[PDB]
Amino acid sequence: RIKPVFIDDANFRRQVSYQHAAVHIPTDIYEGSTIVLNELNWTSALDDVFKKNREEDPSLLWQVFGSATGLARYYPASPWVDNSRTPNKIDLYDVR
């Protein structure tokens, strides 16, 4: 994992990190299945195009690649609104 810096932003009512893209994996999809770890491998080369799109037009909101394996890689990184069970409530968000 990565521990990001999370500056606070406008045009986002939250804290964003313009260094790397965040990943969302549905609650009941294991992160480590060879199918999921492969998406997290070849998607790692999206972050530079995310960055250059953003610095070409500083008024972009979320950019997201939502893939057929449940993952969703969005930019700029920002912690998801519902953690799995760190709060009491579950998140049921499936990008598909």
Binding site: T27, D28, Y30, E31, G32, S84, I90
Partner: peptide, 19 residues
Amino acid sequence: ECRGYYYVYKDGDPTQMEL
């Protein structure tokens, strides 16, 4: 395969789930 979390449904109700 049997790794990670999953949902269980109390009372078989599709809207009352537990991790």
